[PDB]
From a paper:
The Staphylococcus aureus pathogenicity islands (SaPIs) are the prototypical members of the phage-inducible chromosomal island (PICI) family of mobile genetic elements. Stl is a DNA-binding protein that binds to the intergenic promoter region between stl and str (the SaPI transcription rightward regulator), preventing transcription of the str and downstream genes, thus maintaining integration of the island in the host chromosome. The remarkable ability of the SaPIbov1 Stl to target unrelated but functionally similar antirepressor proteins relies on the modularity of this repressor. In this way, SaPIbov1 Stl presents three domains: one corresponds to an HTH N-terminal domain required to recognize and bind the divergent stl-str region present in the SaPI genome; a second (middle) domain responsible for interacting with the trimeric Duts, while the C-terminal part of the protein recognizes the dimeric Duts.
The structure of BovI-StlC-ter in complex with the Dut of phage ϕO11 (DutϕO11) at 2.9 Å was solved by molecular replacement using the structures of each individual component previously solved by our groups (4 and this manuscript). To form the BovI-StlC-ter–DutϕO11 heterocomplex, both proteins exploit their own homodimerization structural elements in such a way that each protein is reciprocally mimicking the other partner. Stl provides the N-terminal part of its dimerization helices α11 and α13, while DutϕO11 contributes with the dimerization helices α2 and α5, generating a surface of interaction of about 1100 Å2. Superimposition of the BovI-StlC-ter components of the DutϕO11–Stl heterocomplex and the BovI-StlC-ter homodimer shows that the Stl helices α11 and α13 of the second chain in the Stl homodimer occupy similar positions to the DutϕO11 helices α2 and α5, confirming structural mimicry as the molecular mechanism used by Stl to interact with dimeric Duts. Additionally, the Stl projects a long loop that connects Stl helices α12 and α13 into the nucleotide-binding site of DutϕO11. This loop (residues 230–241), which was unstructured in the free form of BovI-Stl, acquires a single turn helix conformation and resembles the DutϕO11 “latch” that comes from one subunit to conform and cover the active centre of the second Dut subunit in the dimeric Dut homodimer. However, this BovI-Stl “latch” is inserted into the active centre of DutϕO11 and occupies the position of the nucleotide. BovI-Stl residues H233 and I237 mimic the pyrimidine ring interactions, with the former residue interacting with the DutϕO11 Q17 and D21, and the second with DutϕO11 F20 and F74. Finally, the interactions of dUTP Mg-triphosphate moiety, which is recognized mainly by the DutϕO11 acid catalytic tetrad comprising E39, E42, E67 and D704, are mimicked by BovI-Stl residues Y234 and K238 from the latch and R253 from helix α13.
Author numbering:
A (entry chain B): 175 to 198, 203 to 262
B (entry chain A): 4 to 49, 58 to 88, 97 to 118, 122 to 157
Write the structure that this text describes.
């Protein structure tokens, strides 16, 4: 289990996050993807928690893992609620 | 307001900063940069308050300053015009999915188009002060 987060998976995640926000009226397949996207968010948060992007914390003042562990899941929650 | 060799004031400031960071390396700079592009792209409508946007923008800039700096851009000295937000996507996407120069070109050309460019700089100089202080 290679510990360090790769550039490509990080890239894949945000991409999927953007496709998600473009799905557009019975399409309930978007909700599944939010469930998927929450879980790999946690996946990435934990990896970055154990093995941190150093330069990110120095320039941002906040740990990068938190962005995946907490903020994106918050966001994907916000999209979940917006629904009817 | 649109820039004229403030490359010696930013490449240094950031040079300045990164030297206070022992474990600094290129793979991580690259990732933080990518993360900040999306972080910034997020702050728009594809929206969020103006103040909050160029903060991410400024955050991307610091990483572009590092790349070229860690690349040792040998004295290289491009202003591009962008019609749409999607025309910035495309650009990043091939510099990324199919690949230093463009990485630093990008946060600036946005400034030219999306904003003022002497208006981004004031966010960068402000934070790095708070940052050089923290470290």
């Amino acid at each position: 289990k290679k510990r360090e987060v790769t550039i490509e998976e990080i890239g894949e995640f945000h991409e999927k996050y953007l496709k998600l926000l473009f799905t557009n009226n019975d399409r309930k397949k978007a909700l599944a993807e939010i469930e998927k996207l929450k879980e790999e968010s946690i996946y990435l948060g934990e990896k970055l928690r154990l093995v941190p992007n150093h330069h990110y914390d120095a320039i941002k003042g906040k740990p990068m893992y938190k962005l995946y562990l907490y903020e994106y899941p918050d966001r994907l929650e916000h999209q979940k609620k917006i629904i009817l | 307001t649109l820039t004229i060799d403030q490359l010696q004031e930013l490449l240094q400031i950031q040079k300045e900063f990164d030297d206070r960071i022992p474990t600094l390396n290129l793979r991580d700079s690259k990732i933080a940069y990518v993360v900040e592009f999306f972080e910034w792209f997020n702050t728009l409508e594809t929206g969020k308050p103006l103040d909050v946007q160029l903060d991410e923008l400024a955050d991307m800039l610091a990483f572009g300053l590092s790349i070229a700096n860690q690349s040792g851009v040998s004295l290289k000295t491009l202003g591009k015009v962008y019609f749409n937000t999607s025309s910035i996507m495309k650009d990043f996407m091939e510099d990324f999915v199919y690949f230093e120069e463009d990485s630093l070109s990008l946060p600036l050309n946005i400034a030219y188009n999306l904003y003022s460019i002497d208006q981004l700089i004031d966010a960068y100089k402000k934070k790095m002060k708070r940052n050089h202080e923290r470290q």
